[PDB]
Amino acid sequence: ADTIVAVELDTYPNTDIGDPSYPHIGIDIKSVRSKKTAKWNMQNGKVGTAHIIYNSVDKRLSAVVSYPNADSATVSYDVDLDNVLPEWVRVGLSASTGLYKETNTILSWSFTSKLKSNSTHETNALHFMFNQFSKDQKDLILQGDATTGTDGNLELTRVSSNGSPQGSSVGRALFYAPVHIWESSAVVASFEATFTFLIKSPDSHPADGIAFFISNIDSSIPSGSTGRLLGLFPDAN
Amino acid sequence: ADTIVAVELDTYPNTDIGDPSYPHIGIDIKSVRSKKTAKWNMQNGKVGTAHIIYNSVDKRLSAVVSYPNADSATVSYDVDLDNVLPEWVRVGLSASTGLYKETNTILSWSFTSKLKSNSTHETNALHFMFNQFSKDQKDLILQGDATTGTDGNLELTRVSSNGSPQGSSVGRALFYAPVHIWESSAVVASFEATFTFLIKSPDSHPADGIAFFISNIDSSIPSGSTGRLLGLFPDAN
Amino acid sequence: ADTIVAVELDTYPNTDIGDPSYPHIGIDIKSVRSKKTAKWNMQNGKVGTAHIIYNSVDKRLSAVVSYPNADSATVSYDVDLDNVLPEWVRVGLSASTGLYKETNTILSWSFTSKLKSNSTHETNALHFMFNQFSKDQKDLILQGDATTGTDGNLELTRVSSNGSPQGSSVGRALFYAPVHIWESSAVVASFEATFTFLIKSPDSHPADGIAFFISNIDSSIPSGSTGRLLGLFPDAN
Amino acid sequence: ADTIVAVELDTYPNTDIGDPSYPHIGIDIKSVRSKKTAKWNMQNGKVGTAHIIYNSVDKRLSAVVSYPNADSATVSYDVDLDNVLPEWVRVGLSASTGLYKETNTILSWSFTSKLKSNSTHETNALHFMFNQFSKDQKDLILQGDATTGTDGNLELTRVSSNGSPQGSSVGRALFYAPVHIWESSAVVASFEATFTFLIKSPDSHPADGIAFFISNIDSSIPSGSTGRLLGLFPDAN
Ligand SMILES: CO[C@H]1O[C@H](CO)[C@@H](O)[C@H](O)[C@@H]1O
Ligand SMILES: CO[C@H]1O[C@H](CO)[C@@H](O)[C@H](O)[C@@H]1O
Ligand SMILES: [Ca+2]
Ligand SMILES: [Ca+2]
Ligand SMILES: [Ca+2]
Ligand SMILES: [Ca+2]
Ligand SMILES: [Mn+2]
Ligand SMILES: [Mn+2]
Numbered sequence: 001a002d003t004i005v006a007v008e009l010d011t012y013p014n015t016d017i018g019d020p021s022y023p024h025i026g027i028d029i030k031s032v033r034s035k036k037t038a039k040w041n042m043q044n045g046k047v048g049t050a051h052i053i054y055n056s057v058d059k060r061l062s063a064v065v066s067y068p069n070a071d072s073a074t075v076s077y078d079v080d081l082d083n084v085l086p087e088w089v090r091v092g093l094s095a096s097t098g099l100y101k102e103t104n105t106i107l108s109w110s111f112t113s114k115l116k117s118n119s120t121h122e123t124n125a126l127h128f129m130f131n132q133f134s135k136d137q138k139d140l141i142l143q144g145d146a147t148t149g150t151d152g153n154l155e156l157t158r159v160s161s162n163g164s165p166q167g168s169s170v171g172r173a174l175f176y177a178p179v180h181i182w183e184s185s186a187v188v189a190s191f192e193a194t195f196t197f198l199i200k201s202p203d204s205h206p207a208d209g210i211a212f213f214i215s216n217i218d219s220s221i222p223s224g225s226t227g228r229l230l231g232l233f234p235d236a237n
Numbered sequence: 238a239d240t241i242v243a244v245e246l247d248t249y250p251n252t253d254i255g256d257p258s259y260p261h262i263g264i265d266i267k268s269v270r271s272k273k274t275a276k277w278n279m280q281n282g283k284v285g286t287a288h289i290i291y292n293s294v295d296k297r298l299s300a301v302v303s304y305p306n307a308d309s310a311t312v313s314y315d316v317d318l319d320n321v322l323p324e325w326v327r328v329g330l331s332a333s334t335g336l337y338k339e340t341n342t343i344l345s346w347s348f349t350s351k352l353k354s355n356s357t358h359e360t361n362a363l364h365f366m367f368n369q370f371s372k373d374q375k376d377l378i379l380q381g382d383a384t385t386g387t388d389g390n391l392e393l394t395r396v397s398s399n400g401s402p403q404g405s406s407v408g409r410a411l412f413y414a415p416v417h418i419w420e421s422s423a424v425v426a427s428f429e430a431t432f433t434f435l436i437k438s439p440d441s442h443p444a445d446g447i448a449f450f451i452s453n454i455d456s457s458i459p460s461g462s463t464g465r466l467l468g469l470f471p472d473a474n
Numbered sequence: 475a476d477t478i479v480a481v482e483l484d485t486y487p488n489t490d491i492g493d494p495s496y497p498h499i500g501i502d503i504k505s506v507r508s509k510k511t512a513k514w515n516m517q518n519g520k521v522g523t524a525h526i527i528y529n530s531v532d533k534r535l536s537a538v539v540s541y542p543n544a545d546s547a548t549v550s551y552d553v554d555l556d557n558v559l560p561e562w563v564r565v566g567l568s569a570s571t572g573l574y575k576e577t578n579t580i581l582s583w584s585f586t587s588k589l590k591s592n593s594t595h596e597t598n599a600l601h602f603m604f605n606q607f608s609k610d611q612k613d614l615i616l617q618g619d620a621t622t623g624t625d626g627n628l629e630l631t632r633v634s635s636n637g638s639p640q641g642s643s644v645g646r647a648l649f650y651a652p653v654h655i656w657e658s659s660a661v662v663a664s665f666e667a668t669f670t671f672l673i674k675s676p677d678s679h680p681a682d683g684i685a686f687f688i689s690n691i692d693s694s695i696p697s698g699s700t701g702r703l704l705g706l707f708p709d710a711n
Numbered sequence: 712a713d714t715i716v717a718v719e720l721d722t723y724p725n726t727d728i729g730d731p732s733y734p735h736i737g738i739d740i741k742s743v744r745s746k747k748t749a750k751w752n753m754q755n756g757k758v759g760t761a762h763i764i765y766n767s768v769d770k771r772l773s774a775v776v777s778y779p780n781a782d783s784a785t786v787s788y789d790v791d792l793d794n795v796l797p798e799w800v801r802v803g804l805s806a807s808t809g810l811y812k813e814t815n816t817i818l819s820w821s822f823t824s825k826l827k828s829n830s831t832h833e834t835n836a837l838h839f840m841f842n843q844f845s846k847d848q849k850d851l852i853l854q855g856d857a858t859t860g861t862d863g864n865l866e867l868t869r870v871s872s873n874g875s876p877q878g879s880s881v882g883r884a885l886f887y888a889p890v891h892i893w894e895s896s897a898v899v900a901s902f903e904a905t906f907t908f909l910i911k912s913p914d915s916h917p918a919d920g921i922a923f924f925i926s927n928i929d930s931s932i933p934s935g936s937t938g939r940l941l942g943l944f945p946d947a948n
């Protein structure tokens with residue numbers, strides 16, 4: 001199986017599997033059952049922003065999600081990524097819908113990674129910023145129903161030509177190049193991620209959510225991982 | 238008086254005011270009596286690196302100092318800078334010598350600051366990087382005995398033409414422009430600082446140390462702040 | 475007098491001093507009589523973008539102004555800034571109105587400067603990005619009628635509370651810290667500037683324009699430099 | 712065949728095919744016969760730096776190579792990359808040796824790319840910086856004799872364990888992710904590349920050289936492209 005570390009923007013409460021009984025953001029370490037969550041007052045139809053940060057000194061993964069003029073939800077968790085992820089990984093965005101749906105539109109996404117090694121100003125860095133997604137985005141690996149082009153945005157889950165979301169959908173987008181997330185002889189390693197999203201739900205409740213994730217290089221969507229599994233996990237264990 | 242927050246690379250143990258009995262790095266919040274320290278195996282004559290980081294989500298100030306192929310000293314401390322520093326500040330480097338001395342040479346210094354406000358991708362940033370210091374460095378405010386030019390380096394404390402350090406010296410270098418370190422309506426604020434130094438001590442023990450600090454805009458060297466006071470504090474309270 | 479190098483977004487044709495007979499962008503070297511201009515199809519009421527670039531290898535100052543889905547105006551000019559500007563300067567934005575007016579609103583502004591000196595990876599850099607202007611913006615020097623705060627934007631020229639522009643107005647905003655624009659022993663020096671603006675003209679013709687400029691550190695608005703002079707030049711020579 | 716645009720640091724004069732009769736840097740557009748060259752006083756055994764720049768406004772490709780305290784060679788050439796390369800490409804470094812040899816060691820390599828599209832602050836960027844090359848560098852595609860690890864450096868051509876260069880060698884290193892070098896609806900596109908190298912020649916004359924290149928995504932070393940062809944071209948046409 002794959003190794004996943006993720007920050008979920010969970011819109012649908014699947015209390016049977018651990019979700020609190022309200023929209024929330026959480027930190028998932030190899031399991032859809034978040035190690036820690038925070039209430040999130042999701043706003044249907046409004047553009048929002050997520051900020052994820054981490055550094056090997058504090059060994060603390062934190063995320064902040066917010067909407068213009070509104071309280072922001074925050075969540076942090078102590079975790080040493082050296083003990084969880086392989087040295088090389090791929091970063092990406094994932095979303096899904098089940099019985100209930102929503103649009104999982106990504107307007108922009110940026111990522112920065114730095115590795116300071118045992119030497120004088122010897123830093124390795126990787127940075128990419130997407131504000132516009134073209135039809136043939138060769139530096140993105142699209143999996144499942146994810147597509148680009150429609151208004152220059154990234155649609156993680158399927159959306160009909162009229163613009164309405166589809167249920168039972170799952171999509172992901174990973175940056176093409178592998179990222180060196182940590183190293184034995186690293187003095188300091190850190191990364192920062194940001195993305196703006198538009199979750200619009202016409203029907204009853206919105207579902208199922210969007211997630212920023214880090215995984216093994218050769219990761220792919222687990223079968224039947226639509227709905228509650230957010231296109232990240234094979235089961236709800 | 239001034240408001241100081243500093244990370245000190247203390248080379249001389251003044252146990253009579255709280256210093257551990259050995260070279261150490263510490264975090265000073267308005268007092269030379271560190272709120273927290275960590276043992277530092279300073280290496281006479283070798284070039285070292287310091288990394289200081291902070292973000293408003295974790296409200297945790299951390300620092301890492303190291304030398305090539307050698308264990309690195311680390312220290313962290315929970316502190317909300319909103320409650321301690323004014324909204325606008327100046328950032329700088331400080332050093333001193335007392336009865337015993339050392340060179341407090343700075344080979345490079347970089348700083349990055351970011352403020353994410355309540356809006357879509359509305360970030361304000363400031364970044365500067367010095368690898369070479371010229372004789373007439375107009376974007377630096379030099380105080381006390383600090384000078385630039387000698388090999389394109391920054392000498393915080395006085396050094397004779399032959400190259401030997403002087404005792405009873407105090408110097409500082411602050412970036413010219415004020416930095417917006419935090420704001421009431423900020424979603425995320427963070428800064429990162431790095432500098433490489435060369436502490437060389439000919440005589441007995443090395444003293445007194447170097448420090449990265451943040452202060453009120455109009456800060457200047459307190460009288461008699463040579464020695465143990467590191468050019469930052471008026472007294473040892 | 476001051477030494478000015480500027481890229482003007484000239485909205486009012488002052489043909490008797492050399493302006494082409496239509497809105498244009500031009501490059502001014504110590505004179506409001508542009509060394510080179512390009513027709514600019516200015517769009518009243520719409521937000522636009524300006525990009526200014528320069529590097530010491532090509533010794534070529536270029537600018538591009540554009541609006542979403544619209545042709546963009548471009549202008550370039552060969553000029554070695556070493557022979558025109560002092561080694562240290564300040565960068566800023568300037569605007570004015572005369573008999574006719576317009577709003578000269580700045581929504582964001584970023585600047586990057588790099589100096590590569592005679593050494594291994596010895597680069598000095600300066601970077602700032604403003605997307606939000608606060609009421610007490612301490613890192614900006616405001617001159618004339620320039621103010622910040624109204625929607626978090628920068629108003630270069632006077633605007634009444636109801637939102638209508640005033641005539642006979644002149645304003646400027648300069649970054650606080652001096653910028654090292656070039657150095658005798660520099661291998662490569664370069665800068666890049668970007669700002670989005672909103673020029674709205676209720677009355678007859680729009681006037682007078684906005685400009686990005688580089689000047690001697692102690693520059694201030696020349697008396698009577700409203701109107702055609704764009705708050706940059708003492709006269710029309 | 713492949714589409715190549717390259718800046719060559721040519722150490723061996725193959726006057727038979729157009730080379731000036733001395734070391735030189737040149738700009739190659741789909742042919743080893745440089746469209747333009749500049750004399751280069753290459754220095755055996757010393758670490759040097761190369762800076763390549765380009766922007767779609769001036770449509771000018773420039774390069775600067777230099778050594779500490781020494782004159783630097785410069786070369787520029789007007790060329791619209793839109794008319795020569797695919798929209799998507801890969802960037803890399805190439806080197807070779809023939810009868811005569813040299814080490815083609817890369818100490819560091821950084822690259823920055825930006826695409827400003829028809830919208831408000833809608834920039835796409837890619838940036839990577841290598842100062843240390845590890846044994847298993849997964850984000851680099853190594854072709855031919857290129858290897859990493861030896862002192863954390865990148866050896867483009869073969870080097871015996873004792874440290875001496877081999878003749879008849881060819882190697883390349885390309886960044887893993889495709890780069891979006893230009894787009895029909897782009898307001899401004901630009902890139903910047905930098906790398907420090909160490910060319911050491913024990914024998915007679917040094918040969919054959921190093922080159923920074925941009926090519927179609929699926930590019931590979933042309934057969935028999937050792938020596939004068941710098942691992943870039945199939946023949947000397
Ligand atoms: C012996 O005490 C003196 O010297 C030490 C070391 O230099 C300083 O810390 C102190 O303030 C005094 O000046
Ligand atoms: C003498 O000719 C050979 O050597 C030179 C220099 O090494 C190469 O340029 C050439 O292609 C051949 O291999
Ligand atoms: Ca759920
Ligand atoms: Ca002490
Ligand atoms: Ca005019
Ligand atoms: Ca040759
Ligand atoms: Mn959940
Ligand atoms: Mn101490």
Ligand SMILES: [Mn+2]
Nearest residue numbers: 484493500508
């Ligand atoms: Mn004009």
Ligand SMILES: [Mn+2]
Nearest residue numbers: 721730737745
């Ligand atoms: Mn050649």
